[PDB]
Design an enzyme around this catalytic site. Structure first.
Site, PDB file in Angstrom:
ATOM      1  N   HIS B  69       1.031  -1.208   0.092  1.00 37.15           N
ATOM      2  CA  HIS B  69       0.027  -0.083  -0.023  1.00 37.15           C
ATOM      3  C   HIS B  69       0.825   1.300  -0.098  1.00 37.15           C
ATOM      4  CE1 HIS B  69      -2.697   3.100   1.992  1.00 37.15           C
ATOM      5  NE2 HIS B  69      -3.638   2.392   1.280  1.00 37.15           N
ATOM      6  N   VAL B  75       2.640   4.152   2.121  1.00 39.61           N
ATOM      7  CA  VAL B  75       2.163   4.957   3.122  1.00 39.61           C
ATOM      8  C   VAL B  75       1.141   4.307   3.875  1.00 39.61           C
ATOM      9  CG1 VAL B  75       0.446   5.422   1.222  1.00 39.61           C
ATOM     10  CG2 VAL B  75       0.650   6.780   3.610  1.00 39.61           C
ATOM     11  N   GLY B  78      -5.017   4.852   5.961  1.00 43.61           N
ATOM     12  CA  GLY B  78      -5.710   5.800   6.945  1.00 43.61           C
ATOM     13  C   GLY B  78      -6.921   5.014   7.620  1.00 43.61           C
ATOM     14  N   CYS B  79      -7.398   3.916   7.043  1.00 38.45           N
ATOM     15  CA  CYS B  79      -8.318   2.918   7.706  1.00 38.45           C
ATOM     16  C   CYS B  79      -7.840   2.451   8.875  1.00 38.45           C
ATOM     17  CB  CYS B  79      -8.806   2.224   6.819  1.00 38.45           C
ATOM     18  SG  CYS B  79      -7.654   0.793   6.264  1.00 38.45           S
ATOM     19  N   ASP B  83      -8.840   2.485  12.678  1.00 33.62           N
ATOM     20  CA  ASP B  83      -9.375   1.458  13.423  1.00 33.62           C
ATOM     21  C   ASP B  83      -8.506   1.307  14.784  1.00 33.62           C
ATOM     22  OD1 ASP B  83     -11.124  -0.983  12.528  1.00 33.62           O
ATOM     23  OD2 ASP B  83      -9.487  -1.959  13.781  1.00 33.62           O
TER      24      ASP B  83
END
Ligand SMILES: CC(C)CNC(=O)COCc1cc(-c2cccs2)on1
Lengths: 167, 170
Positions: B69, B75, B78-79, B83
């Protein structure tokens, strides 16, 4: 031009080879949360500004069931959510815009069901609400498991970032 | 409620169901566990006077998500930082001594306005508890922010997590 993509199409995207270097990539496994895009267009949808429909096939051996959680497997919501961001990014690249994709956030998100390892297929439905030209997309999305709606997200935002665009 | 910090091993014990007991809140195990340690957790103070958590995730280029990713452009997703904030709010509920398994219920606004590159040292989460409702289901509402080496990059308003002595309905 093309309105459907196979898993290999998506893997080719993940290597930078569908939309070209410096433009939108999907992630590779194990972050890639999509097996195929069944329909993508830039007309119709809830808002008349486009639609995607994508699938992820499920079986008990998917990695995240082991660790989330021991003795209580369920797909993580965040990963279904990211699917939706991944899909909105793909849309932007598919339209022919340049630059790398980044999620910028969302409004409401709701989880009201779960993806258990006895599931067969997850389906994402994304409805494009607006594209602003920095270039960005706003969409609503839902996630469903074998026909049943379980997550919703309003106001998903993804932007594209060129050489000259910084965070 | 007595202990105000946890080591990584405390968190791994939690992930096996062994910190709060069977049928109560668990963190996820690697590779979904997005926290290395909880530096501060309490049920007073914070922004709203209803509690606070401060937790850290150490960053190195080796973390699995950087490979996939994305290829040629690593990077942190964001998810996953998101979480972490849900994971933490669930931990809070179990740490307060409530029974049941945790499920993220959602949030209001989330904003990503920076990123975690593999050259970073440490991500820090700051969660402020806004409300706990105990009326029928037990649930928590909080705001959170995520930072990377001192710099604020994500925010989340109205994170919600609930506990369930019976998830069977979903
Ligand atoms: C928007 C308000 C109604 C929140 N929704 C609820 O009360 C219904 O129950 C929540 C629930 C959540 C999940 C999952 C969580 C994470 C991965 S799956 O499985 N059941």
């Amino acid at each position: 031009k093309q309105h459907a993509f196979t898993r290999e199409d998506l893997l080719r995207c993940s290597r930078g080879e569908l939309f070209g270097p410096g433009n939108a990539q999907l992630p590779a496994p194990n972050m890639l949360m999509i097996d195929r895009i069944v329909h993508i267009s830039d007309v119709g949808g809830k808002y008349g500004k486009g639609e995607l429909v994508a699938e992820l096939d499920i079986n008990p051996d998917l990695w995240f069931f082991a660790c989330h959680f021991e003795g209580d497997p369920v797909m993580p919501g965040c990963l279904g959510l990211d699917a939706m961001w991944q899909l909105v990014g793909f849309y932007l690249g598919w339209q022919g815009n340049p630059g790398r994709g980044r999620a910028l956030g969302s409004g409401e998100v709701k989880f009201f069901g779960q993806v258990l390892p006895t599931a067969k297929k997850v389906t994402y439905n994304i409805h494009i609400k607006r594209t602003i030209n920095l270039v960005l997309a706003i969409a609503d999305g839902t996630v469903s498991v074998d026909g049943r709606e379980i997550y919703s997200a309003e106001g998903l935002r993804v932007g594209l970032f060129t050489s000259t665009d910084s965070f």
